Symmetry: D2
Subunit: 445 residues, 4 copies
Amino acid sequence: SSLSRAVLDGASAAEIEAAPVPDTYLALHLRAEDADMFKGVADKDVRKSLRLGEVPMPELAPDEVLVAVMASSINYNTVWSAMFEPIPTFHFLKQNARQGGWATRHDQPYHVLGSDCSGVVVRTGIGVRRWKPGDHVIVHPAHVDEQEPATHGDGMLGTEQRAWGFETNFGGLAEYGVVRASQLLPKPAHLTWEEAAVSPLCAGTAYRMLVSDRGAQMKQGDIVLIWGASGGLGSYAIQFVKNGGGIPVAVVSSAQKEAAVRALGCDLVINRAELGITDDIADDPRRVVETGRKLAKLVVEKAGREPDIVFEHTGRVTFGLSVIVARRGGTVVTCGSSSGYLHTFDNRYLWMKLKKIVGSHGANHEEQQATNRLFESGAVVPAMSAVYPLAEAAEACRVVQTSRQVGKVAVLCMAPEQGLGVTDPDLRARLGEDRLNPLRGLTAT
Amino acid sequence: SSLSRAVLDGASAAEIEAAPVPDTYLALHLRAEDADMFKGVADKDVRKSLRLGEVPMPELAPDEVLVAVMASSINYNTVWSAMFEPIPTFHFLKQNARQGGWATRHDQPYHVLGSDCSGVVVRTGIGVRRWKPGDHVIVHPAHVDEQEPATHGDGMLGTEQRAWGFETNFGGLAEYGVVRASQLLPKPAHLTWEEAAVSPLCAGTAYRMLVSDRGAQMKQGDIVLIWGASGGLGSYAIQFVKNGGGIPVAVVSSAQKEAAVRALGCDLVINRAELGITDDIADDPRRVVETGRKLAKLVVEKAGREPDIVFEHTGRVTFGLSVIVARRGGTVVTCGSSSGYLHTFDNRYLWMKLKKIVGSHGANHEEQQATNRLFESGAVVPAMSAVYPLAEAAEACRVVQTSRQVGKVAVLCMAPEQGLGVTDPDLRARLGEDRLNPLRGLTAT
Amino acid sequence: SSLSRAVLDGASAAEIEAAPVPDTYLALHLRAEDADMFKGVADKDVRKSLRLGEVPMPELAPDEVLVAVMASSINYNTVWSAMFEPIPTFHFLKQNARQGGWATRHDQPYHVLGSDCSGVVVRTGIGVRRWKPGDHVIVHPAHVDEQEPATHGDGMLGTEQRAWGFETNFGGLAEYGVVRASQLLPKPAHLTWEEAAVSPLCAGTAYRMLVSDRGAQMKQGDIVLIWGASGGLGSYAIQFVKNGGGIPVAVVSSAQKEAAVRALGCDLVINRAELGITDDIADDPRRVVETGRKLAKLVVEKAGREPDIVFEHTGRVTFGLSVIVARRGGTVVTCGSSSGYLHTFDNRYLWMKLKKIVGSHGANHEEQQATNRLFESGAVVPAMSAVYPLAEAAEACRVVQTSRQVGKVAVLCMAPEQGLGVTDPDLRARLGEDRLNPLRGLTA
Amino acid sequence: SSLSRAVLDGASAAEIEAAPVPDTYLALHLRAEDADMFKGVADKDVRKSLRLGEVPMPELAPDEVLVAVMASSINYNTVWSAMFEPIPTFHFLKQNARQGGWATRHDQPYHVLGSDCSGVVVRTGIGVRRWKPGDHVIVHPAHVDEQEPATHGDGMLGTEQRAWGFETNFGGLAEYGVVRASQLLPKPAHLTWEEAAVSPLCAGTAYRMLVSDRGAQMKQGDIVLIWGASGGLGSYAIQFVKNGGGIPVAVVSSAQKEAAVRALGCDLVINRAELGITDDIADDPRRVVETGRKLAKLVVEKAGREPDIVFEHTGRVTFGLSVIVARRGGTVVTCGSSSGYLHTFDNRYLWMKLKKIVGSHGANHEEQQATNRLFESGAVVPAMSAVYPLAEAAEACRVVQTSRQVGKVAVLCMAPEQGLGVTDPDLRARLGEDRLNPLRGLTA
Ligand SMILES: CCCCCCCC(=O)SCCNC(=O)CCNC(=O)[C@H](O)C(C)(C)COP(=O)(O)OP(=O)(O)OC[C@H]1O[C@@H](n2cnc3c(N)ncnc32)[C@H](O)[C@@H]1OP(=O)(O)O
Ligand SMILES: NC(=O)c1ccc[n+]([C@@H]2O[C@H](COP(=O)([O-])OP(=O)(O)OC[C@H]3O[C@@H](n4cnc5c(N)ncnc54)[C@H](OP(=O)(O)O)[C@@H]3O)[C@@H](O)[C@H]2O)c1
Ligand SMILES: NC(=O)c1ccc[n+]([C@@H]2O[C@H](COP(=O)([O-])OP(=O)(O)OC[C@H]3O[C@@H](n4cnc5c(N)ncnc54)[C@H](OP(=O)(O)O)[C@@H]3O)[C@@H](O)[C@H]2O)c1
Ligand SMILES: NC(=O)c1ccc[n+]([C@@H]2O[C@H](COP(=O)([O-])OP(=O)(O)OC[C@H]3O[C@@H](n4cnc5c(N)ncnc54)[C@H](OP(=O)(O)O)[C@@H]3O)[C@@H](O)[C@H]2O)c1
Ligand SMILES: NC(=O)c1ccc[n+]([C@@H]2O[C@H](COP(=O)([O-])OP(=O)(O)OC[C@H]3O[C@@H](n4cnc5c(N)ncnc54)[C@H](OP(=O)(O)O)[C@@H]3O)[C@@H](O)[C@H]2O)c1
């Protein structure tokens, strides 16, 4: 379109504003009628549910910004949505729309997925401040209600807090995304679109979990055991732990995943097999205890002490272990349950050793700015390992679904090719393209 | 006007929306032309600056709500405003307006003061959720930018955080107020307009300082020394301390003010003449130490220990004392400097005894809701001691200026008479009108 | 003995020092040779394992205080001790003793139980400061190693932190207790021995869980769901919640337990049976969710919102519910698992709603002082519901074992009768005997 | 003596035990009679007050450890005490002794100074655990009362918290030191005595101020403005800031002090002199504001934003600036007032911007362990810039008195030369001697 062309041409703020908004846009999406298609299905192949096609351009709310999405990423929630698990997102869209007003737009027979992105502002609602068409932005997933009192204590805490592209429509896996202005941050200038896009959700989430005073709040010298360490969350977890003067201990399930975490500077790596952790471990209290003890011993061996923080998200199969291995007074911080949300743990290890389990979710706008600042300095780098064109986003999603990736799989959206969007090439040169892409071309194959 | 009649008649939502917004409204305001009128003037009589007259109705921003203000209150900032101290509010209005967009409205040759209020929603911007015309609200003063990341960590912390009616125009000492939706809370139903109006600013502020995890965060058993205890802040500080299971020790300068704090159930009272505190004490390090020591001894006598938290706002005169008197590891929490902001203190007492000074300001929307909840249950009650019509708001202001009040001086705005706006009379009856007005009829003389 | 006679007669410090320490003392204790007596026994009747008789007086460590124990209390760990479950306490005693030095004394074939007490200092180790014979004290259970760096961040957090009389010997269900001076606090002067003795462990634990910045750290206005609310822990929880301007909502399993919590001024009460809780709800995730929702709904109806803090200790059966019922950003604070330590919960409710589970154990010396200060002002009162003489402490223990109690079962030790040890009768009279004993005579 | 010989020879624990404790030992000390010796003297030259000679070996308390002090360091309190400023330390010794019991020993007509050290345990009181003669230790200054409840919440917060060798006698600027066992941590093995010795007081203090949850509690990304940055405190502050992934901005008064901070990898430096700071700036409110603004801008230029934490200790001259420059919601953490304790600041800057001033002092045993762990891993290195023998400790003290130093001036005590005490040479070599001594030979 004239708008996409203007965006892609690096046209001026005024020219971008002057290019009309298309009536439809290309979006990776789910269809409400398919929400039952995986009933009984063992391998709920996201490529079967994901559609790519034109969806209606919605009306922009006054506090919203239309972003020409240059790139986005696959997040696990993209996978979960495409799997209609644990609940089809359409149920969330309907709950969202039940607020009425502007919220109603979310309830659509399609759901445009994508929960972070980088791109270019093309329109702002009349209540949007500062942002101008042409502005290079990243969008983080915290779609929150700033009228809620809770939001002003913690952006993540409001009852209306939602994840963009998951509990909201108009996500980032599309040529355009509709975001609340409080989802917007300036794109790190030295990064490409795809590099910038891969971070907000996972890095912000890891940031809240580990760095922010809203999570485990690591300090230098903390040993952080990081489960599923080579993945999206883990790839950032590692960096925050290292950057904060912590000692990460990566738990990975393969040599390739080990390679990935080492590329991120995590030299202390535990392979799940050297502990014979298998999925049925969670049903076996004694084995959990025995393996937790062994795991603790290993962490002690590698890092010098039991972990201060255990970075959880792998869920039920590891959670028992996590509770056990954390040092007395330690914190298990969890933001997920990939292996199952029904967690079982021995409470004696929690109360008797005064441990904490901190439930964490996404990151508020402040945490996301903090995260962004760490990218802006090059302290933290994108965990991008692969890039797919939007045309192949279902496959990108599948890759994540099948755990064939390390780090983050980026999806070019409107960006016609890789390597665009660097507006501070000197800084990029100073940090180094390689330093910025530790995971380039690595897989979990 | 038809709109004010509709509001006063308790009209339906539709009737209120159908009633046109007046082009102008009655407002207590200052005039930009008067900013220097107190140059080299000792007693800057607020009544010489305060104007009451029609001001233009501004256009409502999309995130704003037009409130038909039923009652408001004099706050000290109203006094500071009318004195053009320490800096004329017009400078703030201009700084505010420099943001552009909707902010430019704030820059006017008039400044409508008033930093809290209760009233009725009459219009909402297209970006406002949930509120509707007819809704009974209180407005608290935290006029914040919800797009700023900092806001999502703490609503008070954004660089665009302003105090309604002080760094913003369209304050509550008028028949209408323009507020951001995130300034709105449901008015405690059992309260009259004037009762509801007196609390948000002072109570929220005291709440942040003492109750909130963002201030000194009292716990039951804490002894809290409360300076200027019979005033707006102290009158709530006392209640939060008591309600928190803390032990308030009121410092007052007079028997009338002691009576005021006793009526709030603060039975540990220190008259500052009993200490021989005079305004020049601050210039005299030795006398501050001696007196601080006497003060500490007195708190020990009355409350059993040195205060855990010193509730400051009286400023330079008391601050050195506040630092000395606080227990080891204690917190001086301060939100003001009525006696002068150039604080001097002996840092030995601060670092050697590992004390903290917590600067606090207003309250974020979360804290304000928490505050409101305590009013809602009747745990905390309005500190209203006097009510003036808007016609006499200048005098009301002068009263506070001349420290002739205890608690809070309410100002009826649109409310034509006292006692209106109780929409939960049963609750009111249960709590008791007298419990709700401990300070009724009390003065500082 | 002349020492016990000196203590009971309120003799001077000099006189107490001149009265020799007896070589043995009367103690409720277990014998290591009984550790196996309940193998294959379903009802591990504590009256069968608990012995009362003379045990050797140990040599006082330099940082220790010999307390003539006027009164103690039954604690849940006392029961578990007497059941030798899940591990005979002797395992903990030997583990303690493996530290060597003074710790070796704890490794004995007898274990004097008792994890709190009130009494009179009779001897101090040469490294004890300030405490003197004749001093009226309470003992709290935090037997900690003050050389450990962790102890100086949080007394509860050292690896050598132990529960007095559970992982240490010379507990307070005896006429004498051997404590570290960092277990000692001045006895609230207006309380009788038994009243003062019932509180340290449970009140301190509840304090840490709810009031302290080491626990959930309630604020006024917080709604606190209190599981097992009529018990030792619950009876103090209710009171700290109330005292701190919180809104307690007690969960109790019966009418009698409801009566107990209301006696403590907890007017919001949910009955567990009301809601169908059995030991297999935990195993039914859909039931936990549906029952949690109902519980949440019931709290919203009662308190106006979902609980800000859930005070857990009941364990597996309620824990899944706890995680569900807590508000967004809410805290489940847990110090035990009465119904089973294998907790199952739906982590979606934890992470998606940014809730926290805070594990808490005991209370450090600071928290215990803060707890004690709340007893000293009368802001919080003892939860004493019953008093047994030491002779009948096995019965008292069986009562707790069989959940026949509410609040705290006190045990007179050296105190020859109830009602002694009040040294501030004026404050006692001011507060009110009944005020101080809201649970007097109540049972489950 | 046979003891010192046994220690320098690395004798077995049993050998160290068999060697008698001398009745006296070599100590850098003050004499009570001299307390008045600088009445009307403007330059209170510490070389005139500091004595080096034999002092009586005190009797060890049960919780105490006698350390063969190998190396110590000059601290500013050493200087202050040698000046008898602001109060002669003897006053604190008498206050300390007023506790009675073991505290009485501290009231002597001599005061042995030295507030940190590295050395070899040679005797332990009967209540001391774990430590054994021969053990290589560092001593940190937190001489605290572990019976005080406060200590169990924070070792620094007890009423009886004292600075070893300042408010206690038997400090470390001597061949032996008497320390409570809760002052002891294992000496980082890869360090020499003097390297190990220079850190505990300054690094632990900086740690508490910056890293600990008891201070400003920096996180990565934080910009930390560090006043007096080349000094003892600053030298560690810079390192904790960098190590925590923070961004330090040093303020130094000179090109040399700048060289020092850059040696510690502080890239961003603001010269104080350029800003115009004089001891009457604080007295000029307008100047403080304009100067604070230029400072803020300087920080913004260098680091990208106003500082998140202002690391204070320079006191009254800088403090008003500190309050001004700190970001909105930022923290000024202060542990001293070198330029004067009468601080003046514009409170509008504090409350209106919701800033905090956190008073900090020393570091509890936990923070000191944590600090020690960062030395153990090599994450933080000693700030030793100079070494004096104990013979020359007065001069070392004078060097610090006259701000001629950068980092930490170490004093060898029983160590007969530099370079001794490395018991993990492999780690030493991996880290690097130069790495471990960034300030070697530097001055101000
Ligand atoms: C949600 C919060 C609720 C708050 C509830 C209630 C709060 C209270 O009651 S607090 C009491 C209100 N009183 C106060 O003193 C707060 C007023 N604010 C201030 O003093 C300042 O903004 C302060 C100190 C916080 C920060 O100042 P700072 O960031 O350095 O600059 P700024 O705000 O622009 O103020 C100084 C500028 O004002 C201008 N100014 C100063 N005096 C005057 C004057 N007489 N006329 C015109 N302009 C003036 C000048 O341009 C000056 O700049 P310069 O340095 O060249 O002289
Ligand atoms: N804000 C939030 O609450 C938030 C944010 C991001 C992610 N999450 C949740 O956190 C989890 C991880 O997300 P992510 O982006 O890091 O995903 P990811 O890139 O796929 O990485 C997950 C890592 O965990 C392990 N893993 C992968 N699939 C798993 C499975 N099905 N079961 C158990 N372990 C598995 C793998 O490591 P090993 O093979 O080494 O075990 C993988 O490297 C997901 O469930 C996600 O939905 C939550
Ligand atoms: N959010 C904030 O930062 C915030 C919010 C509210 C108020 N404040 C500031 O807090 C201060 C008190 O506000 P308030 O509403 O409590 O005012 P108030 O109702 O007038 O009460 C102030 C009390 O302080 C003492 N006092 C009065 N005038 C004083 C003066 N000129 N100098 C020193 N002490 C004086 C009086 O007690 P004695 O006569 O017993 O000493 C009076 O009771 C003001 O400076 C206000 O601007 C700040
Ligand atoms: N420092 C610590 O970590 C610490 C300190 C004190 C206690 N605790 C633990 O906290 C729990 C409560 O002890 P506390 O003295 O209150 O004991 P308690 O006096 O017996 O009170 C426990 C309450 O919880 C319920 N309960 C009792 N037995 C139960 C069971 N087997 N399963 C489920 N619920 C049960 C009962 O309430 P209703 O039947 O409604 O439910 C009872 O009133 C125990 O696990 C104890 O070991 C831990
Ligand atoms: N635990 C505690 O409370 C604790 C612990 C250690 C130290 N302290 C206090 O912290 C302060 C610094 O001690 P530290 O060993 O860094 O001392 P230091 O090695 O002398 O370093 C002090 C730095 O502060 C500056 N300075 C020195 N004298 C000054 C003065 N009179 N006025 C203003 N600035 C001055 C110098 O920096 P230049 O670049 O600025 O001008 C010097 O490099 C002392 O007052 C000490 O008593 C307190």
